[PDB]
mmCIF file of all heavy atoms in Angstrom:
data_model
loop_
_atom_site.group_PDB
_atom_site.id
_atom_site.type_symbol
_atom_site.label_atom_id
_atom_site.label_comp_id
_atom_site.label_asym_id
_atom_site.label_seq_id
_atom_site.Cartn_x
_atom_site.Cartn_y
_atom_site.Cartn_z
ATOM 1 N N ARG A 1 -79.204 48.929 -39.170
ATOM 2 C CA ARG A 1 -80.060 47.976 -38.644
ATOM 3 C C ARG A 1 -80.379 46.805 -39.567
ATOM 4 O O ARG A 1 -80.337 46.880 -40.805
ATOM 5 C CB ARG A 1 -81.439 48.495 -38.285
ATOM 6 C CG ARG A 1 -81.201 49.401 -36.918
ATOM 7 C CD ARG A 1 -82.429 50.347 -36.685
ATOM 8 N NE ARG A 1 -83.520 49.542 -36.351
ATOM 9 C CZ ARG A 1 -84.731 50.044 -36.086
ATOM 10 N NH1 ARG A 1 -85.066 51.253 -36.342
ATOM 11 N NH2 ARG A 1 -85.678 49.158 -35.621
ATOM 12 N N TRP A 2 -80.413 45.572 -39.046
ATOM 13 C CA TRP A 2 -80.983 44.429 -39.846
ATOM 14 C C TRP A 2 -82.556 44.405 -40.039
ATOM 15 O O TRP A 2 -83.192 44.839 -39.109
ATOM 16 C CB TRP A 2 -80.622 43.187 -38.920
ATOM 17 C CG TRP A 2 -79.226 42.802 -38.907
ATOM 18 C CD1 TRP A 2 -78.442 43.063 -37.714
ATOM 19 C CD2 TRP A 2 -78.475 42.217 -39.829
ATOM 20 N NE1 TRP A 2 -77.146 42.565 -37.983
ATOM 21 C CE2 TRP A 2 -77.132 42.153 -39.313
ATOM 22 C CE3 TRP A 2 -78.698 41.812 -41.139
ATOM 23 C CZ2 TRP A 2 -76.092 41.558 -39.911
ATOM 24 C CZ3 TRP A 2 -77.678 41.202 -41.744
ATOM 25 C CH2 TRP A 2 -76.475 40.983 -41.236
ATOM 26 N N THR A 3 -82.813 43.965 -41.240
ATOM 27 C CA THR A 3 -84.250 43.849 -41.340
ATOM 28 C C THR A 3 -84.745 42.582 -40.555
ATOM 29 O O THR A 3 -83.862 41.661 -40.184
ATOM 30 C CB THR A 3 -84.566 43.410 -42.914
ATOM 31 O OG1 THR A 3 -83.979 42.145 -43.233
ATOM 32 C CG2 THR A 3 -84.169 44.605 -43.718
ATOM 33 N N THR A 4 -86.101 42.528 -40.326
ATOM 34 C CA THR A 4 -86.609 41.202 -40.068
ATOM 35 C C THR A 4 -86.292 40.254 -41.118
ATOM 36 O O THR A 4 -85.728 40.501 -42.244
ATOM 37 C CB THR A 4 -88.048 41.354 -39.621
ATOM 38 O OG1 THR A 4 -88.878 41.856 -40.672
ATOM 39 C CG2 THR A 4 -88.073 42.275 -38.254
ATOM 40 N N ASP A 5 -86.723 38.969 -41.063
ATOM 41 C CA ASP A 5 -86.602 37.989 -42.067
ATOM 42 C C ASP A 5 -87.301 38.353 -43.272
ATOM 43 O O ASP A 5 -88.455 38.734 -43.295
ATOM 44 C CB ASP A 5 -87.008 36.592 -41.515
ATOM 45 C CG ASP A 5 -86.140 36.024 -40.577
ATOM 46 O OD1 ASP A 5 -84.880 36.454 -40.459
ATOM 47 O OD2 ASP A 5 -86.501 35.037 -39.823
ATOM 48 N N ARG A 6 -86.705 38.121 -44.476
ATOM 49 C CA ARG A 6 -87.442 38.377 -45.771
ATOM 50 C C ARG A 6 -87.301 37.091 -46.528
ATOM 51 O O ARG A 6 -86.412 36.431 -46.630
ATOM 52 C CB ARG A 6 -86.593 39.549 -46.674
ATOM 53 C CG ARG A 6 -86.710 40.891 -46.011
ATOM 54 C CD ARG A 6 -88.144 41.342 -46.082
ATOM 55 N NE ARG A 6 -88.067 42.705 -45.537
ATOM 56 C CZ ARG A 6 -88.373 42.879 -44.218
ATOM 57 N NH1 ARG A 6 -88.519 41.825 -43.328
ATOM 58 N NH2 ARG A 6 -88.182 44.140 -43.550
ATOM 59 N N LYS A 7 -88.434 36.871 -47.282
ATOM 60 C CA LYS A 7 -88.581 35.849 -48.323
ATOM 61 C C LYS A 7 -87.764 36.366 -49.493
ATOM 62 O O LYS A 7 -87.884 37.402 -50.034
ATOM 63 C CB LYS A 7 -89.957 35.520 -48.694
ATOM 64 C CG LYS A 7 -90.634 34.736 -47.694
ATOM 65 C CD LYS A 7 -92.158 34.874 -47.631
ATOM 66 C CE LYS A 7 -92.959 33.701 -47.002
ATOM 67 N NZ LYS A 7 -94.295 34.146 -46.585
ATOM 68 N N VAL A 8 -86.864 35.426 -50.042
ATOM 69 C CA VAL A 8 -85.985 35.677 -51.122
ATOM 70 C C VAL A 8 -86.312 34.623 -52.269
ATOM 71 O O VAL A 8 -86.114 33.496 -51.957
ATOM 72 C CB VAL A 8 -84.557 35.493 -50.846
ATOM 73 C CG1 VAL A 8 -83.706 35.937 -52.104
ATOM 74 C CG2 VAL A 8 -84.129 36.603 -49.851
ATOM 75 N N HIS A 9 -87.009 35.131 -53.259
ATOM 76 C CA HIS A 9 -87.413 34.258 -54.479
ATOM 77 C C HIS A 9 -86.397 34.144 -55.488
ATOM 78 O O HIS A 9 -85.814 35.274 -55.905
ATOM 79 C CB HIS A 9 -88.714 34.818 -55.147
ATOM 80 C CG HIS A 9 -89.908 34.759 -54.522
ATOM 81 N ND1 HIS A 9 -90.167 35.585 -53.255
ATOM 82 C CD2 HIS A 9 -90.990 34.142 -54.592
ATOM 83 C CE1 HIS A 9 -91.339 35.360 -52.669
ATOM 84 N NE2 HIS A 9 -91.922 34.531 -53.575
ATOM 85 N N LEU A 10 -85.869 32.997 -55.562
ATOM 86 C CA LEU A 10 -84.899 32.627 -56.675
ATOM 87 C C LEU A 10 -85.610 31.909 -57.868
ATOM 88 O O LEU A 10 -86.600 31.518 -57.676
ATOM 89 C CB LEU A 10 -83.806 31.652 -56.069
ATOM 90 C CG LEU A 10 -83.222 32.348 -54.898
ATOM 91 C CD1 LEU A 10 -82.972 31.191 -53.931
ATOM 92 C CD2 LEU A 10 -81.997 33.147 -55.066
ATOM 93 N N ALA A 11 -84.908 31.817 -58.958
ATOM 94 C CA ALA A 11 -85.546 31.105 -60.197
ATOM 95 C C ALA A 11 -86.121 29.795 -59.828
ATOM 96 O O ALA A 11 -87.349 29.650 -60.135
ATOM 97 C CB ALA A 11 -84.380 30.871 -61.376
ATOM 98 N N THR A 12 -85.430 29.027 -59.011
ATOM 99 C CA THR A 12 -86.101 27.756 -58.559
ATOM 100 C C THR A 12 -85.911 27.394 -57.112
ATOM 101 O O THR A 12 -85.400 26.231 -56.747
ATOM 102 C CB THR A 12 -85.644 26.583 -59.674
ATOM 103 O OG1 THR A 12 -84.601 26.792 -60.168
ATOM 104 C CG2 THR A 12 -86.823 26.423 -60.674
ATOM 105 N N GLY A 13 -86.395 28.183 -56.202
ATOM 106 C CA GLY A 13 -86.697 27.979 -54.873
ATOM 107 C C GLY A 13 -86.775 29.329 -54.111
ATOM 108 O O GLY A 13 -86.586 30.388 -54.802
ATOM 109 N N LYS A 14 -86.912 29.159 -52.881
ATOM 110 C CA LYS A 14 -87.096 30.328 -51.969
ATOM 111 C C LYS A 14 -86.142 30.189 -50.795
ATOM 112 O O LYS A 14 -86.167 29.129 -50.207
ATOM 113 C CB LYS A 14 -88.536 30.517 -51.526
ATOM 114 C CG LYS A 14 -89.221 31.476 -52.466
ATOM 115 C CD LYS A 14 -90.826 31.429 -52.345
ATOM 116 C CE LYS A 14 -91.270 31.602 -50.941
ATOM 117 N NZ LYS A 14 -91.378 33.056 -50.456
ATOM 118 N N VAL A 15 -85.575 31.153 -50.179
ATOM 119 C CA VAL A 15 -84.920 31.135 -48.971
ATOM 120 C C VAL A 15 -85.391 32.340 -48.075
ATOM 121 O O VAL A 15 -86.089 33.210 -48.541
ATOM 122 C CB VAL A 15 -83.315 31.283 -49.095
ATOM 123 C CG1 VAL A 15 -82.800 32.546 -49.704
ATOM 124 C CG2 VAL A 15 -82.631 30.894 -47.940
ATOM 125 N N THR A 16 -85.155 32.189 -46.718
ATOM 126 C CA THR A 16 -85.464 33.408 -45.943
ATOM 127 C C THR A 16 -84.089 34.019 -45.576
ATOM 128 O O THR A 16 -83.184 33.284 -45.152
ATOM 129 C CB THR A 16 -86.127 32.874 -44.609
ATOM 130 O OG1 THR A 16 -87.383 32.232 -44.968
ATOM 131 C CG2 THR A 16 -86.563 33.890 -43.708
ATOM 132 N N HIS A 17 -84.108 35.257 -45.561
ATOM 133 C CA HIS A 17 -82.750 35.977 -45.234
ATOM 134 C C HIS A 17 -83.018 37.379 -44.666
ATOM 135 O O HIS A 17 -83.952 38.053 -44.999
ATOM 136 C CB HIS A 17 -81.750 36.004 -46.408
ATOM 137 C CG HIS A 17 -80.396 36.405 -46.093
ATOM 138 N ND1 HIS A 17 -79.601 35.661 -45.369
ATOM 139 C CD2 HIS A 17 -79.740 37.637 -46.362
ATOM 140 C CE1 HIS A 17 -78.280 36.221 -45.291
ATOM 141 N NE2 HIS A 17 -78.437 37.396 -45.675
ATOM 142 N N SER A 18 -82.012 37.827 -43.782
ATOM 143 C CA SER A 18 -82.231 39.206 -43.273
ATOM 144 C C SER A 18 -81.012 39.883 -43.758
ATOM 145 O O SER A 18 -79.883 39.520 -43.780
ATOM 146 C CB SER A 18 -82.346 39.197 -41.800
ATOM 147 O OG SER A 18 -81.315 39.032 -41.095
ATOM 148 N N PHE A 19 -81.351 41.256 -44.162
ATOM 149 C CA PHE A 19 -80.430 42.114 -44.771
ATOM 150 C C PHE A 19 -80.121 43.269 -43.849
ATOM 151 O O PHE A 19 -80.954 43.672 -43.144
ATOM 152 C CB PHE A 19 -81.186 42.631 -46.016
ATOM 153 C CG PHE A 19 -81.341 41.548 -47.156
ATOM 154 C CD1 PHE A 19 -82.385 40.702 -47.021
ATOM 155 C CD2 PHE A 19 -80.445 41.511 -48.239
ATOM 156 C CE1 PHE A 19 -82.667 39.853 -47.863
ATOM 157 C CE2 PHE A 19 -80.692 40.468 -49.172
ATOM 158 C CZ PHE A 19 -81.831 39.692 -49.099
ATOM 159 N N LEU A 20 -78.806 43.788 -44.022
ATOM 160 C CA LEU A 20 -78.614 45.192 -43.379
ATOM 161 C C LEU A 20 -79.269 46.253 -44.224
ATOM 162 O O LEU A 20 -79.086 46.310 -45.436
ATOM 163 C CB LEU A 20 -77.153 45.439 -43.359
ATOM 164 C CG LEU A 20 -76.464 44.805 -42.082
ATOM 165 C CD1 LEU A 20 -74.944 45.323 -42.480
ATOM 166 C CD2 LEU A 20 -76.927 45.288 -40.698
ATOM 167 N N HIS A 21 -79.917 47.255 -43.560
ATOM 168 C CA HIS A 21 -80.410 48.309 -44.365
ATOM 169 C C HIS A 21 -79.331 49.412 -44.368
ATOM 170 O O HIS A 21 -79.148 50.071 -43.312
ATOM 171 C CB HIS A 21 -81.732 49.002 -43.705
ATOM 172 C CG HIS A 21 -82.120 50.082 -44.667
ATOM 173 N ND1 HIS A 21 -82.734 51.157 -43.915
ATOM 174 C CD2 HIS A 21 -82.065 50.257 -45.948
ATOM 175 C CE1 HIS A 21 -82.974 52.174 -44.847
ATOM 176 N NE2 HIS A 21 -82.578 51.638 -46.109
ATOM 177 N N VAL A 22 -78.616 49.520 -45.503
ATOM 178 C CA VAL A 22 -77.641 50.527 -45.549
ATOM 179 C C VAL A 22 -77.871 51.459 -46.784
ATOM 180 O O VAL A 22 -77.385 51.240 -47.948
ATOM 181 C CB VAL A 22 -76.284 49.824 -45.792
ATOM 182 C CG1 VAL A 22 -75.007 50.972 -45.779
ATOM 183 C CG2 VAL A 22 -76.101 48.709 -44.843
ATOM 184 N N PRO A 23 -78.560 52.663 -46.469
ATOM 185 C CA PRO A 23 -78.885 53.467 -47.528
ATOM 186 C C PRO A 23 -77.556 54.065 -48.173
ATOM 187 O O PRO A 23 -77.499 54.415 -49.320
ATOM 188 C CB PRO A 23 -79.845 54.589 -46.906
ATOM 189 C CG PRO A 23 -79.686 54.413 -45.411
ATOM 190 C CD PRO A 23 -79.289 52.953 -45.110
ATOM 191 N N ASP A 24 -76.515 54.411 -47.287
ATOM 192 C CA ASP A 24 -75.356 55.005 -47.819
ATOM 193 C C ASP A 24 -74.341 54.057 -48.621
ATOM 194 O O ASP A 24 -73.198 54.115 -48.713
ATOM 195 C CB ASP A 24 -74.589 55.626 -46.565
ATOM 196 C CG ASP A 24 -75.555 56.511 -45.731
ATOM 197 O OD1 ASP A 24 -76.161 57.319 -46.326
ATOM 198 O OD2 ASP A 24 -75.673 56.107 -44.501
ATOM 199 N N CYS A 25 -75.017 53.168 -49.387
ATOM 200 C CA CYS A 25 -74.313 52.271 -50.335
ATOM 201 C C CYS A 25 -74.985 52.440 -51.713
ATOM 202 O O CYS A 25 -76.231 52.644 -51.776
ATOM 203 C CB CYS A 25 -74.586 50.865 -49.816
ATOM 204 S SG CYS A 25 -73.958 49.562 -50.625
ATOM 205 N N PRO A 26 -74.146 52.405 -52.793
ATOM 206 C CA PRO A 26 -74.693 52.881 -54.022
ATOM 207 C C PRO A 26 -75.767 51.714 -54.591
ATOM 208 O O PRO A 26 -76.651 52.108 -55.353
ATOM 209 C CB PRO A 26 -73.564 52.876 -54.980
ATOM 210 C CG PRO A 26 -72.416 51.950 -54.383
ATOM 211 C CD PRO A 26 -72.734 52.367 -52.837
ATOM 212 N N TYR A 27 -75.603 50.444 -54.257
ATOM 213 C CA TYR A 27 -76.604 49.562 -54.615
ATOM 214 C C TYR A 27 -76.633 48.285 -53.602
ATOM 215 O O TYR A 27 -75.819 48.053 -52.734
ATOM 216 C CB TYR A 27 -76.448 49.088 -56.133
ATOM 217 C CG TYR A 27 -74.998 49.159 -56.479
ATOM 218 C CD1 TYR A 27 -74.122 48.399 -55.913
ATOM 219 C CD2 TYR A 27 -74.605 50.123 -57.579
ATOM 220 C CE1 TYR A 27 -72.708 48.499 -56.080
ATOM 221 C CE2 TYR A 27 -73.173 50.157 -57.915
ATOM 222 C CZ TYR A 27 -72.281 49.316 -57.018
ATOM 223 O OH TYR A 27 -70.944 49.252 -57.270
ATOM 224 N N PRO A 28 -77.714 47.503 -53.783
ATOM 225 C CA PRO A 28 -77.957 46.316 -52.967
ATOM 226 C C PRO A 28 -76.862 45.372 -53.191
ATOM 227 O O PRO A 28 -76.340 45.367 -54.418
ATOM 228 C CB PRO A 28 -79.280 45.786 -53.522
ATOM 229 C CG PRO A 28 -79.960 47.022 -54.369
ATOM 230 C CD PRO A 28 -78.910 47.846 -54.802
ATOM 231 N N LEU A 29 -76.485 44.683 -52.187
ATOM 232 C CA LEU A 29 -75.370 43.836 -52.272
ATOM 233 C C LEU A 29 -75.772 42.483 -51.874
ATOM 234 O O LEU A 29 -76.421 42.261 -50.788
ATOM 235 C CB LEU A 29 -74.200 44.207 -51.366
ATOM 236 C CG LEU A 29 -73.627 45.578 -51.479
ATOM 237 C CD1 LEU A 29 -72.514 45.939 -50.399
ATOM 238 C CD2 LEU A 29 -73.094 45.816 -52.893
ATOM 239 N N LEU A 30 -75.407 41.331 -52.568
ATOM 240 C CA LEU A 30 -75.549 40.038 -52.117
ATOM 241 C C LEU A 30 -74.240 39.622 -51.635
ATOM 242 O O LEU A 30 -73.208 39.451 -52.472
ATOM 243 C CB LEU A 30 -76.058 39.150 -53.301
ATOM 244 C CG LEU A 30 -76.731 37.857 -53.080
ATOM 245 C CD1 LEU A 30 -77.461 37.357 -54.299
ATOM 246 C CD2 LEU A 30 -75.718 36.850 -52.772
ATOM 247 N N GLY A 31 -74.056 39.473 -50.357
ATOM 248 C CA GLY A 31 -72.686 39.282 -49.794
ATOM 249 C C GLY A 31 -72.490 37.822 -49.425
ATOM 250 O O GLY A 31 -73.292 36.926 -49.814
ATOM 251 N N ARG A 32 -71.452 37.649 -48.693
ATOM 252 C CA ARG A 32 -70.983 36.161 -48.498
ATOM 253 C C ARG A 32 -72.030 35.454 -47.624
ATOM 254 O O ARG A 32 -72.017 34.153 -47.733
ATOM 255 C CB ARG A 32 -69.671 36.308 -47.748
ATOM 256 C CG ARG A 32 -68.462 36.844 -48.470
ATOM 257 C CD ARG A 32 -67.270 36.466 -47.958
ATOM 258 N NE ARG A 32 -67.013 37.113 -46.707
ATOM 259 C CZ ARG A 32 -66.403 38.405 -46.478
ATOM 260 N NH1 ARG A 32 -66.054 39.098 -47.561
ATOM 261 N NH2 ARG A 32 -66.154 38.756 -45.434
ATOM 262 N N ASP A 33 -72.777 36.008 -46.770
ATOM 263 C CA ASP A 33 -73.667 35.426 -45.816
ATOM 264 C C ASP A 33 -74.745 34.581 -46.844
ATOM 265 O O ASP A 33 -74.942 33.523 -46.529
ATOM 266 C CB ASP A 33 -74.508 36.403 -44.972
ATOM 267 C CG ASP A 33 -75.095 37.562 -45.616
ATOM 268 O OD1 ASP A 33 -74.819 37.733 -46.878
ATOM 269 O OD2 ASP A 33 -75.879 38.345 -45.033
ATOM 270 N N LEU A 34 -75.172 35.242 -47.873
ATOM 271 C CA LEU A 34 -76.185 34.658 -48.761
ATOM 272 C C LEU A 34 -75.589 33.716 -49.694
ATOM 273 O O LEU A 34 -76.073 32.763 -50.141
ATOM 274 C CB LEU A 34 -76.895 35.760 -49.580
ATOM 275 C CG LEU A 34 -78.471 35.899 -49.303
ATOM 276 C CD1 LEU A 34 -79.220 36.851 -50.195
ATOM 277 C CD2 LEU A 34 -79.248 34.591 -49.183
ATOM 278 N N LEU A 35 -74.352 34.162 -50.298
ATOM 279 C CA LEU A 35 -73.582 33.318 -51.122
ATOM 280 C C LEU A 35 -73.314 31.908 -50.461
ATOM 281 O O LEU A 35 -73.484 30.737 -51.094
ATOM 282 C CB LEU A 35 -72.300 33.795 -51.619
ATOM 283 C CG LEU A 35 -72.493 35.116 -52.548
ATOM 284 C CD1 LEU A 35 -71.242 36.050 -52.752
ATOM 285 C CD2 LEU A 35 -72.949 34.681 -53.876
ATOM 286 N N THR A 36 -73.041 31.851 -49.165
ATOM 287 C CA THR A 36 -72.732 30.644 -48.506
ATOM 288 C C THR A 36 -73.983 29.787 -48.313
ATOM 289 O O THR A 36 -74.058 28.552 -48.478
ATOM 290 C CB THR A 36 -71.751 30.735 -47.189
ATOM 291 O OG1 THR A 36 -72.392 31.822 -46.445
ATOM 292 C CG2 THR A 36 -70.394 31.335 -47.547
ATOM 293 N N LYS A 37 -75.012 30.450 -47.926
ATOM 294 C CA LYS A 37 -76.328 29.884 -47.703
ATOM 295 C C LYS A 37 -76.904 29.290 -48.972
ATOM 296 O O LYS A 37 -77.264 28.152 -48.896
ATOM 297 C CB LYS A 37 -77.316 31.002 -47.284
ATOM 298 C CG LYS A 37 -78.736 30.527 -47.083
ATOM 299 C CD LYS A 37 -79.552 31.623 -46.534
ATOM 300 C CE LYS A 37 -79.275 32.013 -45.138
ATOM 301 N NZ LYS A 37 -80.151 33.080 -44.581
ATOM 302 N N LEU A 38 -76.609 29.904 -50.179
ATOM 303 C CA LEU A 38 -77.196 29.392 -51.325
ATOM 304 C C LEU A 38 -76.166 28.379 -52.100
ATOM 305 O O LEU A 38 -76.465 27.825 -53.127
ATOM 306 C CB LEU A 38 -77.447 30.627 -52.475
ATOM 307 C CG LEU A 38 -78.525 31.612 -51.978
ATOM 308 C CD1 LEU A 38 -78.600 32.646 -52.932
ATOM 309 C CD2 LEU A 38 -79.871 30.906 -51.804
ATOM 310 N N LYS A 39 -74.910 28.434 -51.670
ATOM 311 C CA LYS A 39 -73.739 27.658 -52.271
ATOM 312 C C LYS A 39 -73.648 28.042 -53.675
ATOM 313 O O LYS A 39 -73.502 27.312 -54.632
ATOM 314 C CB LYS A 39 -74.049 26.145 -52.186
ATOM 315 C CG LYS A 39 -74.501 25.650 -50.823
ATOM 316 C CD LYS A 39 -73.366 25.423 -49.827
ATOM 317 C CE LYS A 39 -73.874 24.873 -48.450
ATOM 318 N NZ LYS A 39 -74.383 26.031 -47.580
ATOM 319 N N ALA A 40 -73.779 29.205 -53.816
ATOM 320 C CA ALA A 40 -73.772 29.944 -55.187
ATOM 321 C C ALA A 40 -72.341 29.872 -55.852
ATOM 322 O O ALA A 40 -71.359 29.657 -55.161
ATOM 323 C CB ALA A 40 -74.242 31.432 -55.078
ATOM 324 N N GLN A 41 -72.340 29.828 -57.235
ATOM 325 C CA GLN A 41 -71.151 29.925 -57.890
ATOM 326 C C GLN A 41 -71.232 31.206 -58.845
ATOM 327 O O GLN A 41 -72.189 31.610 -59.429
ATOM 328 C CB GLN A 41 -71.006 28.848 -58.795
ATOM 329 C CG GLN A 41 -71.134 27.455 -57.991
ATOM 330 C CD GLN A 41 -70.871 26.251 -58.725
ATOM 331 O OE1 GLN A 41 -70.815 26.355 -60.037
ATOM 332 N NE2 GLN A 41 -70.817 25.204 -58.112
ATOM 333 N N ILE A 42 -70.013 31.801 -58.936
ATOM 334 C CA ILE A 42 -69.982 32.979 -59.879
ATOM 335 C C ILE A 42 -68.985 32.629 -60.862
ATOM 336 O O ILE A 42 -67.879 32.225 -60.683
ATOM 337 C CB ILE A 42 -69.406 34.325 -59.029
ATOM 338 C CG1 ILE A 42 -70.313 34.569 -57.869
ATOM 339 C CG2 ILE A 42 -69.459 35.521 -60.079
ATOM 340 C CD1 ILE A 42 -69.640 35.521 -56.810
ATOM 341 N N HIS A 43 -69.515 32.789 -62.205
ATOM 342 C CA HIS A 43 -68.667 32.419 -63.254
ATOM 343 C C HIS A 43 -68.329 33.483 -64.102
ATOM 344 O O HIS A 43 -69.211 34.231 -64.441
ATOM 345 C CB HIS A 43 -69.280 31.228 -64.187
ATOM 346 C CG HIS A 43 -69.620 30.054 -63.403
ATOM 347 N ND1 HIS A 43 -69.440 28.697 -63.802
ATOM 348 C CD2 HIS A 43 -69.840 29.779 -61.922
ATOM 349 C CE1 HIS A 43 -69.751 27.815 -62.964
ATOM 350 N NE2 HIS A 43 -69.959 28.426 -61.836
ATOM 351 N N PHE A 44 -67.046 33.888 -64.328
ATOM 352 C CA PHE A 44 -66.672 35.002 -65.261
ATOM 353 C C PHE A 44 -66.410 34.408 -66.567
ATOM 354 O O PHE A 44 -65.841 33.444 -66.869
ATOM 355 C CB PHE A 44 -65.405 35.642 -64.693
ATOM 356 C CG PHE A 44 -65.646 36.520 -63.567
ATOM 357 C CD1 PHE A 44 -65.807 35.823 -62.309
ATOM 358 C CD2 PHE A 44 -65.841 37.797 -63.695
ATOM 359 C CE1 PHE A 44 -66.177 36.603 -61.067
ATOM 360 C CE2 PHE A 44 -66.327 38.633 -62.611
ATOM 361 C CZ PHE A 44 -66.394 37.982 -61.331
ATOM 362 N N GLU A 45 -66.754 35.244 -67.639
ATOM 363 C CA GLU A 45 -66.714 34.798 -69.088
ATOM 364 C C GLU A 45 -66.028 35.635 -70.115
ATOM 365 O O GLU A 45 -65.945 35.213 -71.283
ATOM 366 C CB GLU A 45 -68.198 34.564 -69.421
ATOM 367 C CG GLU A 45 -69.203 34.300 -68.285
ATOM 368 C CD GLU A 45 -70.613 33.933 -68.801
ATOM 369 O OE1 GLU A 45 -70.921 32.943 -69.297
ATOM 370 O OE2 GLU A 45 -71.404 34.910 -68.831
ATOM 371 N N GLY A 46 -65.399 36.819 -69.620
ATOM 372 C CA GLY A 46 -64.917 37.649 -70.775
ATOM 373 C C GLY A 46 -66.050 38.599 -71.050
ATOM 374 O O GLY A 46 -65.889 39.883 -70.824
#
């Protein structure tokens, strides 16, 4: 099931997002739905 809308506090702003509740996953995932919404960038460094 999807959650209802949740407030997501970021360092410098807030967004509303709904998440799937998947207990059979080893950890919380920030997937493409939120990455695209936030226009996030992931930088690899060594």
Side-chain angles (χ1 to χ4, degrees):
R1 290 168 72 189
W2 289 103
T3 64
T4 56
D5 287 345
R6 292 289 179 273
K7 282 150 165 164
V8 180
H9 293 65
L10 307 145
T12 28
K14 262 162 64 74
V15 69
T16 298
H17 192 66
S18 76
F19 291 79
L20 277 181
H21 180 218
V22 189
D24 311 305
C25 184
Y27 31 59
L29 305 177
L30 200 162
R32 301 194 289 274
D33 52 353
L34 248 183
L35 294 163
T36 52
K37 178 176 286 182
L38 301 176
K39 314 279 179 283
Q41 308 182 352
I42 308 165
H43 297 218
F44 285 79
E45 332 184 85

